[PDB]
Symmetry: D4
Subunit: 185 residues, 8 copies
């Protein structure tokens, strides 16, 4: 089953994490972790602050490489360098409504590409991505070259967007405390 073959990754982030804010009594990041854990056996968190908080929920924390690369691609590479799986499903800490069929639909729509990401009908979410570790070398070269754009990298690896337009508000991103209030129960 996909459950035992794809490693889930919460991209908790940067260099308080807004992901710590509670939505309906549960921290945003935990909404993501719990959705991943329902679909996937082994799930880890990429975090570079508050490591103890993430770890305390029972999740292994992976810190960024000491190369000090920028942005979400840095976390993806760090996780591929420190985890042995073939496949990783990454998701940022602030998209709490990710759907229960995230991994399956991304997997089914890979069409043999080494990377796919979500398009929600209105926009791309390139950091909600199913990624094969075979692009580790390409990613390392990209970041070493000083590049940082996520979707450009994923296209250059041969990736494509996968349509989730039928999954109503599943990809809402909670940018701020104010947006969070529009969603509170």
């Amino acid at each position: 089953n996909l459950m035992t073959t794809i490693t889930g990754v919460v991209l908790a982030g940067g260099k308080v994490d807004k992901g710590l804010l509670e939505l309906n009594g549960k921290p945003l990041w935990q909404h993501v972790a719990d959705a991943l854990m329902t679909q996937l056996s082994h799930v880890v968190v990429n975090a570079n602050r508050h490591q103890e908080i993430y770890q305390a929920s029972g999740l292994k924390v992976i810190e960024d490489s000491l190369a000090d690369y920028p942005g979400p691609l840095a976390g993806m590479l760090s996780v591929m360098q420190q985890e042995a799986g073939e496949w990783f499903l990454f998701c940022p800490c602030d998209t709490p409504y990710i759907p229960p069929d995230l991994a399956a639909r991304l997997n089914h729509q890979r069409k043999d590409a080494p990377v796919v990401w979500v398009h929600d009908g209105e926009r791309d979410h390139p950091t909600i991505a199913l990624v094969n570790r075979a692009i580790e070398p390409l990613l390392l070269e990209y970041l070493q070259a000083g590049e940082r754009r996520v979707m450009v990298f994923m296209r250059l690896a041969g990736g494509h967007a996968v349509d989730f337009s039928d999954h109503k508000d599943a990809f809402v991103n909670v940018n701020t405390p104010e947006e969070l209030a529009r969603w509170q129960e």
Copy 2:
């Protein structure tokens, strides 16, 4: 072949079984068992009464866990706890006309989901389902939490309905003796 990789399961049921009523001289439940056995090598019955009757046809009987959980989800969990296969095709005892391509079409339409169930064009039949044992833990947690709704559980596991609208009256359910007479040869 699918024949040797999916375990068939007749959900015979609850806590006389109407499934014992004869349709064209063969008990309703045996119509289901025979359809499954044409498609699948290893087929078992989940039953908690009349065990000897089901067993006498040459089928292994699996009784519900002693946890005493409610409804069809209880039978599904009990069967996953007592049978070693990866995949199970469950079907209630009162849908005698299930088609010869049930397993194949559900399998082909999984789209990497761990569970799929039949939609006949007019309604869902969530207990006619192809289920991967990877959702055993989720199911146990669900039932332990006191929940019982079948389709809600299957959606929460990442499942989806599969269209059988082209299979004419294959999913008729014989609810009563009277409906049975509308179908007798």
Copy 3:
């Protein structure tokens, strides 16, 4: 796991079956069936009389081909013609003490041969055999030619004996009521 990939077969037999005699309150044949069922998910009985008795324990009964071939090889061929698996573990109905690691040790010692059988340290037991269905054609030709010897056939298929000399009295065969009394609890 081997449990879900090898079909167990009780060779109950010929053309009352002594296998119906009780050992410690359980019929000899059921001792074999239960040992197989502990190791293997799907287990069937090759029987040509008392079919209802074997079937009543929850086991599918396979009757001999109508070709009317002689001996245990006839049952093996009939089972391969009527069951879809790749691998079969056959055992006669009168060796009640067969060990819990029968399938694993035969499987592990195959050394890529399509058939292996037990040698108990003193003699061969050619009908206690792990057999790949690829020898179905060879077997059919053999029986069609009028041949019946079991071990000769298994050698001609490229098979070999596997040493069980360390499994103390596990291969005792209960030939008669008198031998049975030497074993009764």
Copy 4:
């Protein structure tokens, strides 16, 4: 590759074979055998007369079971009983224009069914079929019951037709010497 996993079978037939008539200087049956051999490594002929003629082209001949069953289903069963492969692509001896992508398109369109056959846009060709050996038991039971209809059997096994409407006159069947003249170069 499919080339090494599916056994090709020319259904040469019955109980002179018109299949011996030359089309453009090559016997009809050899047109079929050559098309199969371009796509498949191992190809055999089911024949019950002129065995030496078929054999002389370098092809193994498989004769019908001695059960004496009727029609093309008899040949299919005989071939599954005498050949070890999992998959068989059968084709009658009088459809000389079968296409170079026959195996691939049937395989790709299986949708997990154990059997598929060609529909040419106007009619079914149920004996041009890709068949998994798992239906051997079902077939044996069917023929033993006295049944003979091909498409009924293939539906009962869970099979379906595959559309070849885009393959222009590839499924012309040469019924007679006169039809053959409409096709001669």
Copy 5:
């Protein structure tokens, strides 16, 4: 790789845990968890007290079934019921020196058995075991029957001991504070 296919399990235990005592500044249980994590990607803890302590190291905690079964077999069953993997490597919390090749050597010596455990040259360590989930049903039946002996169960499943006599004091068990002092740096 084995690293991504076997789930590691620390059997932390019963119904303060001595496993919390520090050896060379690291709690005994963490010595086991760290050895497992060097060999295996996904590692969990079976604990029924101090859950927060185990969880805080980044490990998922699995609590015993509510069936309330006795002993280490209870933990094994609970973990198989709540985790989706095929294979589990269990180790008690008080054998801190387990070797770096534990999983590989147990895996390599399985000889197709569904369960193997360590023999250190002087005694069996039946709870240091590599176990296939196919024995889940057998285990459930065993515990339901009121049985508790570990090695008896593992033999009945078809398991065997694997020789680690060459791994010098790797299987020392720290029974008490006093034995711990014989080992402190």
Copy 6:
């Protein structure tokens, strides 16, 4: 991943190579090699002149068979005779804009055929092809017979074109120095 299972091949060619002309400071052939190397681990060059130039970029050079067959099919056969992989993705040296998802889309669209090639919306590019080595024998026979047409061969093997009409000018072929100037940065 596809990256490690398909061998990339630059068809550099014939019996100066225009492929040596620089586009935006990089030789045309290197544009192809670099695009292949982003998608595929192991990439080689079929060249029969300037071998040292191609080799100096770190690529293994494969020279044509001494059979002296004509055209691109000759190079394909030579590469299959001298390289051990199952799958090869061939591309001529003068299509510098080949897309990053070339291998994946051809692979995904194989529909079980042993060979597929690109159709760009306006024309076929039969030498931009994903080819299974199983057609090596067919190819050898074809060339031995004196035949040379590429697309005819690929159809006779059971191949088909795959639509790349959505990949804007990715298949521009630089025929001459003048066309090259229409493309220079």
Copy 7:
């Protein structure tokens, strides 16, 4: 099964074939072909004279490459160039007593080498060999270089001899009419 994964090859030979002489009423070469066919589904003959005789038994004949290379290695290469399988079991036409477990024992003793050959206790039989097609390129280079020694080539490919010293006179080679008389029934 090995039966469907290894192609058998009778090395009938050179540039009447003594292999045509009858042993116990069956031509020597047919003794080899029949032994191979008992173990392997698909078996072919490498012959460069009397092609019609070999073909008439139902076997496909493969003729040597037109490169005109010398000796048995030439036949091996020709067969790998004209047959799609991964594995080939070659045997010369004059070793009529080859054993029924030839393929299995060579396969089991490969120890991951791409080629193995028989040692009968007194001498090597390098042309009785199980060969992976991955050494096709190496073989082509070897023969192109003008080399011909068989065992030297097989060692250079990483091969080794496999002990058949326990298979009594199974590897007798019938060199002449006189030796043949020492063996006639």
Copy 8:
């Protein structure tokens, strides 16, 4: 075949390379590269000077990470970070006589360990090693911690030595110009 699944790596080295000295007219490093290339399809060189020389032979050059880690472990990690394969066979540039069965014997003797290295009968050669990429994370952590010993790392990963004592002088290391003269033809 192993040929297409293990990436060969020449550890050319440090921070003229003695590996450039000619043995029998071929540079020492090329003796290693050629031995690897006979056994493995895809072979690369880890070099940090004279990159152009290594590249000119047709081999891809991989330079060390910019982390600037010390010794051969640094090269191994750099290659795993920049190459997508699962398995790597590393060999230093100065052991020109490495045997033709290096990969097979190391592979066969893995006994499920993620790393194995050569013992020649007198000493370990820890840099002649077959390594699974699953130990990439462990290696990164090891080097980050400031550790450098090779064999200690390989043991900590669960590795073991494999006996090559029967391969006469195959592991001679050419330390100097003087030792080289003891070996010159």
